[PDB]
Amino acid sequence: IFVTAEEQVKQSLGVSVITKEDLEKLPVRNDISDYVRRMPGVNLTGNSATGQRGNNRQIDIRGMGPENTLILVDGKPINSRNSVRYGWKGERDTRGDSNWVPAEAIESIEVLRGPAAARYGSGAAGGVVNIITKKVTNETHGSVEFYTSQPEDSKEGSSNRVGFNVSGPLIKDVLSYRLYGNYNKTEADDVDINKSIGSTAAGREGVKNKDISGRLAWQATDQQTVLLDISSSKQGNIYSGDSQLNANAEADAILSQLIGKETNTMYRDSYALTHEGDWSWGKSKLVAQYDKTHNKRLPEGLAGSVEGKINNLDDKATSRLETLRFNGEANIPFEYYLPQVLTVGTEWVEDRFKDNVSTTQGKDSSGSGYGDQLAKGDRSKMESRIASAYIEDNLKVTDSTDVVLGLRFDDHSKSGSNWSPSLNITQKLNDYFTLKGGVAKAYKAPNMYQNAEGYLLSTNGNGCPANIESRCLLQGNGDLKPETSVNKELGIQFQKDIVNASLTWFRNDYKDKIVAGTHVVGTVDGSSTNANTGAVTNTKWNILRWENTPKALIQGFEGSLGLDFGDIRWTNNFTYMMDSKDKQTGNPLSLVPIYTINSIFDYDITDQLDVNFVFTQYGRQKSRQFAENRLESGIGSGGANSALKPSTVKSYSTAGINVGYKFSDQISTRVGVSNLFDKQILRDSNSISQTYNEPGRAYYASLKYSF
């Protein structure tokens, strides 16, 4: 049977595929990023290379930053983090969107890196993580699973899960369901975990997850199928003391009270309806989906020494993000000169966003604050629309040569239209080798804060670019161009039986990335009235705006190695990172080790008994190297002492073992330990390299009923 372009590029070098089986052999604590991170060209890093909110690490692909990692679930985009205020330097106080589907509910995970991911449009310049959930089943198969992790160190949080999955027929062979549920609670790290090295940065914040999700599958005709997906999730945090400038939580009037409490809460509801036709001329797929996300959390400083810190014990505000999305698509096999499979498709997406707490700034009772002049109209509501169409061909150019030619057109309501060409070649050399490559141009539309004229922020001086003197404002920009990136990869794939290997060069030229601008587009006079006196004072502000900056360069090598001896097996990879630099600042896009080596080992001792070993090795993580504002350039209010202090985390390694006993056909269980050598790093507030907590030694166990 025929093979579409989409299917074919999942044979690309920059693609890997995790199974339910892998996931079982190496249990996750909560967030799957802890297993996804082990793939070639993948990292776990903060939202920006500044290090702020460093324990908020999420899936990074080839060092392009997590804003550039598009998470999908069964093919449908998640975008809940856009709820969260995106700040002056690219920071967001989110944990991201790789934690919406409980580990035990996952059938498969597809990681697409580089050229193979540009297909999927806005936000895929880094890559795509496609979480594939368990399927409907024509006989009732059940699962219940528990998990616990138990850190040696008293100050690190233990974690606990329970969850179920059940699927069956309601009507044999025409209507069937899948339903899965999960309650996870990972306790926070103590407030004071990082103190023993003079550091005021918080440890990891905890999370209570509540997830429920339902699928109905209906075979309406011999050639027509209808899927319904309804899911709802709630994520409530457990506050560990985090704050953008790493204040001393325990000695802060307010924060000290919020510890161990829920200060932010993330709600997500999602509905999708899908129709799939199986026609004589080929195949078709229509999708409607609607997503509703609320972001409820305590308010915060939005400038100065209080920036990024909680103002208040009580007055929670909520932000509301609705997405409606439609997708239609057809696959037709035909033969003109060569065998082909033409894909042709349409996509429509609209976003509506309410945010009334971030979109207030420079409002003054005189009616002449800086924002009263620059931002008029309802600043609280933002719209985005993308209309897209694409065409794709999978050609057998020879019985040895498989080639994919795609083109994608995108038209965004603010940024304009944009073309994304996409080549992808597979070329057998012989029974054992094969050559592979792709070139693709990825897209990303501005994020809503970056676009929005009603979003204003300020510094008194320190945040200003080193070449400006006093006070700067940063406004959103409706006239931004979209982010574009030409992503190339090329490599060799080897496979005898028992042995396989790849090596692949990758290189992305990332263009017009949207960031805090450095040119003053003009100036404005802003009145600031004294609350109690009515005394006015006018301030000349320099106006900066979000702006696309010309070029960043990413480059490196991925290799992988597989050694299968039946009962004994080894899966290893490495990734070497030759280049991560913006050609203007000289800084890296995203803090990631210069190299990362991974090894997984499996040995089935008996049919029941199993042992499993994991080892990971990280080369050196350098900090940002070059100043981009007054403070960093040694001319802020703190002078030369507050100047940038580049530093680099020294390389290191961690390991883990399991013994995995299947007590029965029905009952499984797995006991193990992680960071076997207690290689434990604490987050240093006085550094811009040591930005995160590497958890120490932890004993964990998981048992699974299967009925």
Ligand SMILES: CCCCCCCCOCCOCCOCCOCCO
């Ligand atoms: C072609 C790229 C592949 C990169 C990995 C190559 C490494 C080859 O190792 C094969 C055997 O792996 C043994 C795994 O066990 C680790 C033993 O040392 C334990 C350290 O505490």
